[PDB]
Every structure is written in C-alpha cells, then in structure tokens.
Amino acid sequence: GSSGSSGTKEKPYKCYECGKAFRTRSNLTTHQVIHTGEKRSGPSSG
Ligand SMILES: [Zn+2]
Numbered sequence: 001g002s003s004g005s006s007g008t009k010e011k012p013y014k015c016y017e018c019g020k021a022f023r024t025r026s027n028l029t030t031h032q033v034i035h036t037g038e039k040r041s042g043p044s045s046g
Contacts (some may be wrong), residue, residue, distance in 0.1 A: 010023065015032055
C-alpha cells in the first residue's frame with residue numbers, strides 16, 4: 001500500500017562523517033568539507 005514513515009521535519013540530514021545535523025543538504029555538505037581532503041594530503045590520513 002501507501003508509503004509514509006519518517007523521523008522529523010527538522011535537521012533531518014545527519015553527517016555520517018562526524019554525526020552532525022542540518023535542516024537541508026547544502027547546510028550539511030558545507031560542513032562535511034572538514035572531512036573532505038584535498039590533493040595535498042596533510043599530516044593526517046585523510
Ligand atoms: Zn561532519
């Protein structure tokens with residue numbers, strides 16, 4: 001039958017990288033950048 005099941009309509013997006021939250025995606029990704037490395041790898045694994 002129909003399909004209706006969710007958790008909430010607020011900060012539904014949760015960063016699987018650290019565990020943060022965000023109302024939308026843009027607001028989330030913009031933060032996920034901290035987990036995104038660049039060509040020039042730093043002292044950390046990445
Ligand atoms: Zn995060």
